[PDB]
Amino acid sequence: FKCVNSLKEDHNQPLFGVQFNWHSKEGDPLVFATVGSNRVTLYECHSQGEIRLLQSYVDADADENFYTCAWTYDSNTSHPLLAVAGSRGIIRIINPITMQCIKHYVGHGNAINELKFHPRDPNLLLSVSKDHALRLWNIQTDTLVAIFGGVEGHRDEVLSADYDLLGEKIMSCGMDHSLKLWRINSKRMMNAIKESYDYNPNKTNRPFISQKIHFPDFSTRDIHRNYVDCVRWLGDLILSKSCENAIVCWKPGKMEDDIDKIKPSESNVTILGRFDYSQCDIWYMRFSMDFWQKMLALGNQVGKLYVWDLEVEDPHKAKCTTLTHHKCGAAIRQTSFSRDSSILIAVCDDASIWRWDR
């Protein structure tokens, strides 16, 4: 990777999120979204390092602060869609062509820290909240499918979550130091999703009933000793980080325990490796993977990038490379690889954007 360009957004506030559109069409340029201040902005990547500015959505509320974005597509038309959310606790579904807000969702109106789309169903949107809960939405029928909470759920802000390969289960994490597993392939949850698709408020009298899921299928506080701010599945394994200069690769149970045989009472975890780095000991820093999960990237609080090659026989054998530029000195909150892994974008606390090409 070589640094080919940079720019800075005019608001001078942190860029909290960046996402390439992995649903961009054949023959079209690569496009990414950034979120920070009260805005979302789209850019196109072009030759000779060009980062072409397109158009923003700016929230009507000057005090909104967007924290997260995620791409999907319209399941009927195929056109890409962009979901954004943050401090106001309002999910906005944005038409990226025109930057129009198509529709919006409110749960209880508390800050949303992350959004994720289901890997198999483009209508299923997961939000994680300052109010300690996760929420699963069906953005086709505009229904709240389930709330994941209760006293056995998270006890402080939820900071991150991720679906596994097939979207059968979710791992969440947050300020309570815990990582929690929630199965969504239970008979109850499969039925709830089916019912959400059958719901049309114009054709019935009932409100749509959301599931209240009050018991995770696994929980641990044994991986990290501070706020857990990023989690991703790697097959049946988990990658997660806190502010302790480490991404830990771990699994529930003992070494030979099948993820799908793990009981809610499971008291053990197995550590398969740990990727250490430097100067990333502030809260709220995300790592990202490429589409194929061959590579892992994380920025630190002084503008350095770490990239791990995961194409090795066991997690602890990952090969690290580092990327620095003398002008890039601000904290990198998130990175995003293009779908083909040819471009890596980093976004920063000073509203700067850095493009690395290979």
Ligand SMILES: CN(C)[C@H]1CN([C@H]2CCc3cccc(F)c32)C[C@@H]1c1cn(C)c2ccccc12
């Ligand atoms: C808990 N919350 C106070 C945080 C969470 N953070 C989201 C976006 C980035 C991120 C990364 C990993 C987990 C995350 F949850 C988040 C937004 C919020 C925030 C509000 N300001 C004013 C901040 C200033 C600096 C850093 C974070 C913030």
